[PDB]
């Protein structure tokens, strides 16, 4: 890491002085340090700290920082005694699955089925555990469905605890290198995704800190490195990367257009530092990068990056919750709000200065209440500059409501599965497939269907991540999970296929079933195999939910051509007669239409001084900006790539 | 001359400065003494 002025000694001394003057001397404060945006206090006697629950809250309010009180390594119970004490203390209904110990910092990681019982009301159990264990606890949710990605990430974090702690200490030292500082100037530059779709990249530059947002890659023009990669030739980006001045990286949501280029920096050691995001976004973006490099490897092209730099990105990732305010820079405070696009999608709120400026980068988001995700947060404490997507900002971009699309899907399933067919719904592993299966489960809740649903591909991992993070879902799903004893994702009608034997058996069985396999636009995977093995069957119907790129198999099927030429392995081409039935219901998309964007602009509080439209076509962005300016009078801009706009 | 002001750099004292008429040889001797790490302190007296 780079070396800066690092005036954190005076700040730490002031924090220690305030702690001494506030926390009673019976606690015996020993060490005070910074781990990322967190303040870590090691005390000799924690038995005189959490006797009143208001003390931690008052200390956090006074210091304006998140406080993680941990015991000193000297006062550490034996791991077996601590583990048995924790297991005996918690209620049996908590169902603690795994317990891991870190004696370097004295931190216990408790993966449990019900984290609420372990934490308790206002953390009253979480502190009290230390009162009998003298270990600082941290609770995570064990998903009901076993997830390979989450387990691998947790194992990597636990095995690399020393390197992770050193990296966190370095990040915390870099963040608080200065006191509360007011920036002289704030600007934002679009290295990608400005007046275009994909490969988004935002750079917020002040006189002290430089923050990168939503760094991603474009897959539509991957053959051309200029149109697929963000602008690395930008002088500000070159100056930041060469000098190592990138303080933080924030990912809006897990997608190739917002997180594809993240491992590229770590592969070539271009940037090292913290990547702030939400845990679902981190897990889903790791899965997306893994499948992207798998696709690149199978296509015969050189892969963009290896899994090792993906693991490095995992080790350099800091997870934040919704509504949590954290210090990522001496002058910038980062908050993540609900977006409603996908699981873990976060609207970024950057508060720069002591009320000097506020920037809201929505990214991809939805305003209507979806069946799986809550509507986007349209209320902020302060707002001066708003950055919003313009993917559907056209004049005629008025999608049909979700009720009509749900009714169409339900009636299509009804008229197709009564003839013994098998409906195939190719969709992205992170996108609208989860909404589709939620709708199918809700329809099956009535009792009108008993067919199985097979989650071929990586849909099982996404569903497992969704189960592991139910607090990021919609209000109805959160209610049904927490205050009621039933899981919609744990329906017995959902089945998982691991290898080709089960999928071939269910293809050749002839029993009615619903197959949801991920291949993008049928570019490769289980979905193309299902289509090839179900092409001669005329009693089944295929469903297309996403846009079909030209020159792909999905577009060829949607065009109605009855002779699809498909290449095959070991030479030759597999060309066969197709009796598939094609349906197109583009209503489950997680992208807000023009009406939703205008409603979000109207209902946002407070009204921003300026609105910047990005992440969409040039004509769409210009039309949306002109419409907003004509309707509300807000000074709107639609800048192209490499455009710096000075805010304050 | 640029600032147009007379002040003592070792001490400050922008007010209590007096003009003394003496030989340039004496000034050279004082400079030689200062170069020889000797500090001559001129205690000024009124002419009357």
């Amino acid at each position: 890491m780079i070396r800066r002025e690092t005036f954190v000694d005076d700040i730490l001394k002031e924090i220690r002085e305030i702690i001494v003057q506030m926390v009673p001397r019976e606690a015996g404060i020993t060490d005070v340090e910074f781990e990322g945006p967190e303040l870590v206090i090691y005390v000799k006697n924690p038995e005189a700290m959490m006797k009143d629950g208001e003390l931690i809250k008052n200390l956090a309010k006074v210091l304006k920082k998140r406080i993680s009180v941990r015991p000193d390594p000297d006062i550490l119970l034996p791991p077996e005694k601590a583990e048995e004490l924790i297991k005996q203390l918690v209620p049996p209904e908590a169902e603690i699955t795994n317990i891991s110990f870190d004696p370097s910092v004295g931190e216990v990681l408790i993966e449990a089925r019900k984290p609420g019982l372990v934490i308790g009301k206002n953390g009253e159990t979480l502190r009290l555990i230390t009162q009998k264990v003298h270990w600082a606890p941290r609770v995570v949710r064990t998903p009901p469905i076993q997830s390979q990605t989450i387990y691998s990430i947790r194992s990597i974090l636990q095995t690399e605890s020393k390197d992770r702690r050193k990296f966190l200490r370095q990040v915390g030292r870099n963040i608080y290198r200065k006191s509360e500082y007011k920036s002289r100037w704030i600007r934002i530059t679009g290295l990608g995704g400005f007046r275009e779709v994909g490969r988004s990249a935002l750079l917020v530059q002040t006189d002290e800190s430089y923050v990168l947002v939503d760094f991603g890659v474009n897959i539509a023009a991957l053959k051309d490195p200029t149109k697929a990669y963000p602008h690395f030739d930008a002088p500000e980006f070159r100056y930041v990367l060469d000098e190592g001045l990138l303080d933080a990286i924030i990912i809006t949501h897990a997608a190739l257009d917002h997180s594809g280029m993240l491992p590229y920096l770590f592969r070539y050691k271009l940037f090292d530092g913290p990547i702030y995001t939400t845990p679902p976004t981190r897990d889903l973006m790791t899965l997306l990068q893994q499948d992207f490099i798998e696709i690149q490897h199978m296509n015969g092209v050189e892969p963009l990056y290896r899994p090792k730099d993906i693991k490095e990105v995992i080790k350099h990732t800091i997870t934040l919750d919704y509504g949590e305010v954290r210090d990522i820079a001496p002058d910038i405070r980062l908050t993540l709000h609900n977006a409603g696009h996908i699981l873990g999608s976060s609207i970024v709120h950057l508060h720069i200065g002591n009320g000097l400026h506020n920037i809201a980068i929505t990214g991809d988001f939805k305003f209507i209440p979806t069946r799986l995700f809550e509507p986007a947060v349209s209320r902020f404490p302060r707002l001066e500059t708003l950055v919003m997507e313009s993917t559907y900002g056209g004049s005629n971009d008025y999608q049909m409501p979700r009720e009509e699309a749900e009714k169409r899907l339900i009636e299509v399933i009804h008229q197709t599965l009564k003839r013994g067919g098998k409906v195939l719904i190719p969709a992205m592993a992170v996108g609208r497939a989860q909404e589709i299966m939620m709708v199918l489960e809700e329809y099956a809740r009535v009792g009108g269907i008993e067919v199985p649903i097979y989650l071929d591909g990586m849909i099982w991992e996404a569903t497992a991540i969704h189960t592991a993070y139910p607090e990021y879902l919609s209000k109805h799903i959160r209610e049904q999970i927490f205050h009621e004893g039933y899981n919609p994702f744990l329906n017995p009608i959902f089945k998982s296929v691991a290898n080709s034997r089960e999928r071939q058996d269910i293809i050749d069985s002839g029993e009615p079933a619903i197959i949801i396999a991920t291949s993008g636009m049928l570019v490769g995977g289980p979905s193309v195999e299902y289509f090839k093995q179900l092409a001669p069957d005329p009693k089944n119907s295929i469903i297309f939910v996403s846009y079909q790129a030209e020159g792909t198999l999905g577009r060829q099927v949607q065009r109605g051509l009855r002779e699809i030429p498909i290449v095959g392995e070991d030479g030759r081409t597999e060309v066969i007669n197709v009796n598939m039935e094609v349906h197109t219901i583009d209503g489950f998309s997680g992208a807000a239409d023009r009406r939703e964007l205008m409603s979000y602009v109207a209902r946002v509080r407070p009204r921003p001084e300026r609105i910047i439209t990005v992440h969409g076509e040039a004509h769409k962005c210009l039309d949306l900006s002109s419409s907003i300016h004509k309707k509300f009078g807000i000074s709107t801009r639609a800048p192209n790539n490499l455009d710096a706009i000075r805010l304050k | 001359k640029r600032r147009g002001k007379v002040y003592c750099p070792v001490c400050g004292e922008d007010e209590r400065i007096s003009k003394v008429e003496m030989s340039y040889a004496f000034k050279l001797l004082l400079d030689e003494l200062k170069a020889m790490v000797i500090r001559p302190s001129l205690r000024l007296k009124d002419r009357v």
Partner: protein, 147 residues
């Protein structure tokens, strides 16, 4: 093997060391080792069994003044033959003086220091506007340690 010091003309210690090496090669001298660090100016070190061999080897060279009577302990010159970048030991916030480069004879303050690229970033104290510049780590010298 005892270490002795040979005083030479400043700026041409390497030439005198090469001349002594050639004399030892072509004259059968019992010289064990010769060291000439770039940081040390005007002197070289000679590992030899005795000072007499040192003064005999340096004899006949007009650029070798004398040999110091004392013997240098090996711990004093142990740090000289150690792989260590010149940027090590430099922390931001102090004041340095730039020995060479386009900013010759200028004092500055260290802002960023990295050892991978063997370079350091300094802001000129005499500049009214703060404009950081990059300079080689071996081109600076510490004048006062501060954070």
């Amino acid at each position: 093997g005892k270490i002795f010091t040979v005083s030479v003309t400043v700026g041409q210690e390497t030439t005198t060391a090469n001349l002594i090496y050639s004399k030892a090669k072509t004259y059968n001298l019992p010289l064990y080792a010769i060291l000439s660090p770039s940081k040390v100016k005007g002197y070289i070190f000679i590992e030899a069994p005795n000072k007499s061999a040192v003064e005999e080897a340096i004899r006949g060279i007009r650029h070798a003044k004398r040999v110091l009577p004392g013997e240098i302990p090996f711990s004093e010159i142990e740090h000289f033959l150690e792989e260590k970048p010149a940027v090590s030991g430099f922390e931001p916030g102090d004041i340095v003086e730039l020995i060479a480069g386009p900013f010759k004879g200028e004092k500055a303050k260290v802002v960023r220091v990295d050892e991978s690229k063997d370079e350091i970033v300094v802001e000129l104290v005499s500049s009214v506007v703060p404009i950081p510049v990059t300079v080689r780590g071996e081109y600076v010298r510490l004048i006062s340690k501060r954070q």
